[PDB]
Every structure is written in C-alpha cells, then in structure tokens.
Amino acid sequence: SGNGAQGTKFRISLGLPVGAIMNCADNSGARNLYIIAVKGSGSRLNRLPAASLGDMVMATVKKGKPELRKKVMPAIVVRQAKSWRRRDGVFLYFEDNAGVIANPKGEMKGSAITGPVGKECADLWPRVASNSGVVV
Amino acid sequence: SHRKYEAPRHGHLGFLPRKRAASIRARVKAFPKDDRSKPVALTSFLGYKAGMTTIVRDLDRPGSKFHKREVVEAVTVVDTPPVVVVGVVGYVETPRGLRSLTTVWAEHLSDEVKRRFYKNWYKSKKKAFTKYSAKYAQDGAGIERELARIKKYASVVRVLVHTQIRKTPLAQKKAHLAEIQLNGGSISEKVDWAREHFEKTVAVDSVFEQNEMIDAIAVTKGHGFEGVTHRWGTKKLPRKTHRGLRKVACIGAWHPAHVMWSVARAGQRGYHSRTSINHKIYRVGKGDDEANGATSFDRTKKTITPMGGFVHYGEIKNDFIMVKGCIPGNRKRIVTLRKSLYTNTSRKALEEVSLKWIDTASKFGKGRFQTPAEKHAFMGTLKKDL
Amino acid sequence: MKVEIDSFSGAKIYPGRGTLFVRGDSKIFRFQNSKSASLFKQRKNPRRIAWTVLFRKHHKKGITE
C-alpha cells in the first residue's frame, strides 16, 4: 500500500488504470485529477498501473485552478466506479470516480469532500475520514 | 540478442506434460507419514463433487480488520457416502521400491464393485471372485494363512475400498475402487482392523473432523485441444497480424535448431490430475440427519441440497464434506479427500469454524428463496397452487 | 448477518447475492440481480413494472392476505 497508509487495505478490484480521469472530490479548486502512477503498484511486461478505492496515486490536474494545474501531486481515490467485493460478500460501486488531492504524508490539501466516499478509503486515511461527510 | 524487457515465464513448467490423466480417478501419490501411536484409521476417502454453495461465518482471527465480523465464503459440497472395505493389500519395501506382496479380498463382493471388473457387465457371466469366495469355505484356511504372511512381511498396509455409488444420484452404477493407507497400530493391528471391517462400511465422520485441513486430489475439467493463448496465458498478438493472432510469435531462436520443451504450444487443456492442499472443512454432515443444512443461528428445516437440486448432479442424501474454497474437478466427478501431509499450525488453519448460514437458493439461476416454504410465504398463493 | 430488501424490486437479498449501488447523492440501492439493476439504470418505474412488489402493492395484487 502507500507509505502513510494507516492499516491494511484488502485487495479491491483495480478499476482506474494509468491515464484515467476522476473528478476532484475535495475542494482545492481542482476539477479533475488525471492519474499518472499508483503507489505500491507492481511490474509486468505490459501491465498498466491501476488504482482502486483508497489507493494513493500520483495524479495531475488537467482542468481547474491554474496554480494547481501543470504539476504532479499525490491524491487518494475516494470513489470508484468499478464494482468491487467486500469481505462481507457484497458487490458495490459508486456512480463516479473521484479522488482528493493530498500531500505524500496523507493530509488533504482541500478542506472538505463533496459526495460520499468509501469505507475502505476512510479507514485507510484518517484525514479523509475526518473530512468525509458521509462514508459508505 | 537479449530479451529487451524481462517478463516472468508463462505457465508452470512443473506440471508438464499437460496430457490427459491416466484414469478418471486421480491416484493418491503420497500418504501421510505413518506413526504407530494413534488408533488405526483410514488416511483418505472417496467422494463425488456435488457442487458449490455460499456460507456466512464470523472471521475469528485477532488483529484483522474483519475480526468478529461477518464474511461470505464459497464452499464446495462433496457427496461422500460410506465406503465399503473389500480387500487388504500388503506392501513390502524393496530396494526397487515398495512392492505389493498379496491382496486378500472379502468373501462377498457387492454388484456395484463387481461391475468394476468388467467392461460389458450386462452380458458377462459375472464369475468374478467365484473360485475365490469358494476359498472362504472350510473356515478360510488359505485366507488366514495369507493374512498371517501379510503380517509377517508387510511394511505398509493399504485397504481396497469402494464407494456405494448407488447411493449417489449418478447414472453410473460401476463403483470406483481405491487403496487407502491405514495409519495406526502395527501391521497386525492394521490387518486385523481391515479383516474386522471386511465387507463393512466406514463413514466419513470417523475419518475426518470439523475444522480439519484436508487435500483434494482429482482430475480436472477437460477442455480438449486449446490454443496457446488460453492454455498458457501468453500475450495475444496485435490485431493486424497475418495468419492469426492467438499464437506465440517466436517459438525459439535459430540455435539450438530445435523447438524447446519450455515453449508454449497448442494442445490439450484440462483433464489432468491435480492435488490441491490446505482446504479447510466447514461441516461434516450426516446423510440421515435431515435439516443438516441449517445451523444454530439458521435453525431452519432445510437440508444442504439447494432448491431444485444441485445443478447437473441431483440432491444430497449421504454424508457430505463442506470444504472451503474450490477443489479440482467438476461436478459428478470422483474426488479423493486426504489428510494433510504435515501438521499445519498456521493461525489461518487453526481457526474454529461455526457456520452462521448455509445457502440453499437455486444454483439454476438467480433464485431469491432458500426453502419452498419461504417462497410460498413471499409469493402468496399462485394459480397452480390449488 | 441480515437479509435486505431490493430497492427496485422488493425481493429479499441474501448475503452476497446481488449488487449495491451508491448514487452521487449518497442514496443507497441494493439490487438482487442484474435484472433489477438494469431496469433501475434504464429508469423504468418500479410502480409500472408488473412483477414488482411496488406494482403489487399499488394494484392490491394478493393484498387480500
């Protein structure tokens, strides 16, 4: 997992490969984050690094606040559209991909999170849990 | 020139050759290292893979994210009617390997196991073991002499047993015969136990226990001729490739001027023998025990058999083994369950499992109900219900 | 464990059977099968889908029980 991950994240079906675009859930002024790499990803002959719920990925702001634009910066995925299976047995998904901008340590750059987030992400990152209005 | 980008090799080279199994019942190649302290007991069993089903249970590992929380797990239910002991084969150990010395059969053999000795039972004279069952006359002097010789020279004792396949819903009436090694007291104790159990049945609850960590040995699902792309998982060639793309591009360099054995090539996939170790038992049910499909939390009056029966198999009416996870082989196929070859002391295998709910919804689609009573209560009275 | 209720259909959801959907406004739907899920995504009215428990309740189908 990530360097600052506070716990173990059971494998969540990877549904956000490198190059994906996910709406900036937080309120830093960024509109969407464009994934360029995933922390903790493996290596294969042609496998694209892919994200999941709660993964901390290096992302880039393709649209939004100009000072935020045009630089690499860490983010944490908080909503995944690919249905995944919890250990409780249920298959669930959100209606949109969404991540939050953050520093490598883990603290969100934004102040509040719009929309719901995932329980896995909230458990892994305490700051996302604190700034998340509704967790599901 | 060197491979530009490294990549792990496709497939596993220790499972070669990928040919068909010798027979539809995989041989138990190895047996648990016998010790002469515990009482005499079988080291395996024969069953028929009925199918799979879903269960709910509390995970009970401290330090986990799901400790004392519900988990939904897939299990395989194996139909295992009690097996009949029919013969004792003794083994001596020779510098050329363990060699069978003699087999002593039971006096009376069932029809379903006598069928195993013919290919055309319908028109055969059924003379098998006639001049051998006549040898049990005059108090079996030759039989006892043979057993005494087995005790005198027998280092490993295996018992010939067969499944009461007539108890299963399978169409085949020809039973399967298999050698299960006796682990227990000395050779005399083993052969005496087998002689007492001649033409006698052994039930599963006497060889396996709940939370026991077993292995499943069976021949996998055959799939016929298969291309390299699915047989080994090699990368598909680009869309614009002439002469086809579901292939391997380079099958080897110029030198050595031969195709290497380690190159993925088209051939049969499946129908190989596979021994999958470390599957945990979740419930050893009893065939005569109705409502065995319920638990202390469930407490319904449903058996393990789903609604409409296990797909392609039928219902469960004998002792069964509900083992966590998938096992090699498809439904209706015989599978040999075996005790673990090593004392697995891992905390994943030392768990105590108490099933909280056993699914019985129809495997024949997306059924919403567990019992016909539940279905009737939910749907009310239908027009056909009169 | 507990049994849920289909958000579109009303059919009981036993553990692991079906899918869970989280709309953008955090509303939670549970679908017993891809049938109900696809009907919901097509935005058909559960009131108008004949075999639904909502249709049965509205039209008093079997309500004499």
Added chain:
RNA sequence: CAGUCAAGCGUUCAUAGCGACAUUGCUUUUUGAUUCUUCGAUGUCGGCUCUUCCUAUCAUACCGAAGCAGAAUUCGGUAAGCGUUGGAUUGUUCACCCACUAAUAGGGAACGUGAGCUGGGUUUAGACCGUCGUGAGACAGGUUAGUUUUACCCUACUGAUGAAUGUUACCGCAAUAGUAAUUGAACUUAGUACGAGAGGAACAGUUCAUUCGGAUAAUUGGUUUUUGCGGCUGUCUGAUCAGGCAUUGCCGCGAAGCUACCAUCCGCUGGAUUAUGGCUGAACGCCUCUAAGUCAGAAUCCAUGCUAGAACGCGGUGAUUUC
C-alpha cells in the same frame, strides 16, 4: 571489463574508499582489420511476441570490511534460485526526461526471432527542395507515396492413438525427466537500542499486499442461436390469432456452458552445503577454523510434496471359452 606496484588524495594515515606515472591481462556486448564461406540469393534495421542460457549482481537470501554510534551509504564473498516496469519525443539501438518500485543490472542465442507479425527506417521505379553539375544526372543531405509469396513433406516441439510380451480386467510400484513460488508494506517490538541533539532500526509475532502459478463458477460481471420471453419497424399471409422474410432484422431482460486478479480458493517441510563465523589442535613446545577431525549456517543443492509413468521395467489380484 579485471589485476599487479605505490607517488599522492583521504585532517592524522598508502592501500575504509580512491589512486597518478607505468605494467600484465581477459571478452567479443562496440568499431575496425582481413576477404576463408556464400553473389545458379542464407530475406537486410528496429519494434512486438516467446523460450533459454552466461555473470562482469541492480534488487532479494546469508555474511566479511569501513573514515560502519544509529539511520543511510560504500567496498567485497558465496550466489543467475527469483525478479528487473508504466510512459512523453524519436524508425531508431542509443539517448533524455516523467513516475512507480526491492530494483528499474549488462549481455548471448546467424548483430535470437519476417513461410511469427509490422513496414516506421533503409532499400528500385513517381515526386519536391537545397548544394554540385553546361547537361543527362549525383548526394548514409532532407521530405512524401510505395504488393512482405508457399508448409500438406522430414525432423524438433505440443498434444493423440497404437501391434506384441498367453487373453482380458482391476489395484499398484517408481527408474527416469520436469518442478515453484516471489517480493513489499502496515501494526507491534519502539520513539526503545544507538545518539549530546538532530535523528533513529532490527530479531520474534500479527494483518495484508506485489509478481507468478494450479484450479473452480456458490456470488458478481461479460458473452446470447435457449433465437427463451416481451417489445418495435418495413413488408407479406383478405382482417384477427398466429406467423414468414430483413445473410442471427433491431432493442430490453436472459438461464445453462465457457469465462475474468473484472470473481473465488489454494500454493508443504527435512537434510546436506557455499560464503561466512566457530571448536579441538599440530605443523612451528608459542599461536592459529585446518593439515587429521569437527559445529552452525544462503532465495544454493538433494530430498518431502506435485506432474508424466519407461508405450521393449516390474509387482499383486480376478476371470480364464468342451458341446
């Protein structure tokens, strides 16, 4: 690419790490030299795919040394078992950046691999430009467009039968050949050891995860000729019902089968060793892991386990044709 010597660097000090002036080598992964083979043709760069091998080891295992307090790092030994990536630009090998990672080590196999692909480049003919030419035309100077043919033969490999050893059937053995698992993170140890402070781990344990592999379809997802149900258009059967056609008419749902790190489960433990650290103890009354002897120990080797079962290796057992 590696040694040998030591003037110096290294505060102090040659050899912790370096190392000039010199000198001895190795490799054919560069480029040359040659012209021995092929000009009655060996298809010619690169990329994709895939297998194996080498070690001059980037990482992982165990250790030695330090200008090794800790942390980090550097040098080195046994070691190729196991991995060594995703991308921007370029045909590019190469290169340079972005980023992840334990790591993004170097190579070979006719500069591996074109009856495997591609044809971006080069490498015919069309054409444009610049320079050189009076001219036709020239330019590893630039640009654009340019048919990539054949296996059914033999062998090799992958799978599949198969004659006879009295016949036939059942249960076995196991020579041999192959073999497999890999790595990281978090918690805890512990803000402890160490350190003035800044900083700051490990051994054990737990939960997971990466890469790989073998299965399986309870669940979820995909696929739909179940042409199963329903709907819809055009036309046709006088209308209705019910149907035909539209190369499977189209749409919604869709069991079963197959299938997905897009799903689930599982992937074992003993010995002998290398490096290395030790013991006893001489050679050499002292001393020394070494000479005799001997202990612990690596992702090593051989076993356990797993795969196939020699179709000319074998065993046990059953029945063995008379009207």
Added chain:
RNA sequence: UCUUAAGGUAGCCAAAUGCCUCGUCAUCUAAUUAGUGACGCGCAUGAAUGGAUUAACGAGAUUCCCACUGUCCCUAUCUAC
C-alpha cells in the same frame, strides 16, 4: 581596404531547403528529437530557375483537443464457412 559583371534587395526560414542540431527562447505535456510561435553570420532560403500571404477546396503530409471505442491494460464469449 581587397574584388567582382553584380555582390542576395523586398521578403521568408532549423521551412519539404540548417551539416553542427535533439540549435536557443516561449507554448503545448508529468515528461515532447514531435507540433506551433519567435530569434537568423541562412553548410546550402529568396524573387515568373517566381518570393510572401492567401478564402474555398484535398482518398495529400503533420500536431493537439472533445466525443468515441477491445488499439491496449487483459482478455472472455457467440454465429456462419
């Protein structure tokens, strides 16, 4: 000051023409030998051996963006022959 017959004017350019060259700066990207805009001592641009620009047009060559997707991650299934 040498010298030619005259000594590249107007213009334009690392352009399909610039070896050094992946020129230098800016923009486009996380990253750009690509694209574009500039700079011009231009090996070897340039005036009907036509220079520059140009609306429309183009099965011409090239870059980026939105939509779109099995091109790909990473493959799976169905039908006919």
Added chain:
RNA sequence: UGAACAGCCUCUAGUUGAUAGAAUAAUGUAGAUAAGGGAAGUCGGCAAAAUAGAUCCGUAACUUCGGGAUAAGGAUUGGCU
C-alpha cells in the same frame, strides 16, 4: 415504406444452380458483443466505434464578400382521437 429506377418485403416472370453427409478441437476468414479506464497500444487513432434522416432553434475566427455552414451546439420525432 421512403425524398428516392437507394436499402428492405411482395406480384407477373425465372431459378432453387454452386459435391454432399456427421460432429462443433485448436488456428483461421467473415460477422458481432464486452464490466472499469478511455489511445496509456502502435511509426501513425491503422481497424473499429461514435454522429447520421426530418422539423425548429443557434451558428465563430477568417473571407476573394461569393463562402466558411449541415460550422460548432441543442430540442422534438410513435400510435390513436
């Protein structure tokens, strides 16, 4: 049907010709569909997908004033009374 000697179905007319039978392995040729992402593939969006008819609205830079233009971008669409 429709704008239509487009495509689809039918009438008069003409054919029912193309070696065939059985199974449904790999690889093919042709046709398709794919969850999440959306060119990250590749020399290059090559192949495919996407949009598409009609009515109404709205339509930029530039321009040789003619065009660009179906620019872009939206809404409606059946049956029956």
Added chain:
RNA sequence: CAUCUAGACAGCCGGCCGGCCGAAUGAACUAG
C-alpha cells in the same frame, strides 16, 4: 648468511640477563 650443551629458538617466572627445557633454529633468496 647467522645463532648454536662456552644452554640455540619458543614458551612461562624473576627483575637486557638469568631459572626451567633439552636440540637444532632464525633471515633473505632460488626452482619443482
């Protein structure tokens, strides 16, 4: 080349010499 029962070297002990202990030892170099 040297030391060597006119007590060699080593080792322990006493303060460079002596006590034990008795017979070869130390240095440089050469080639198989």
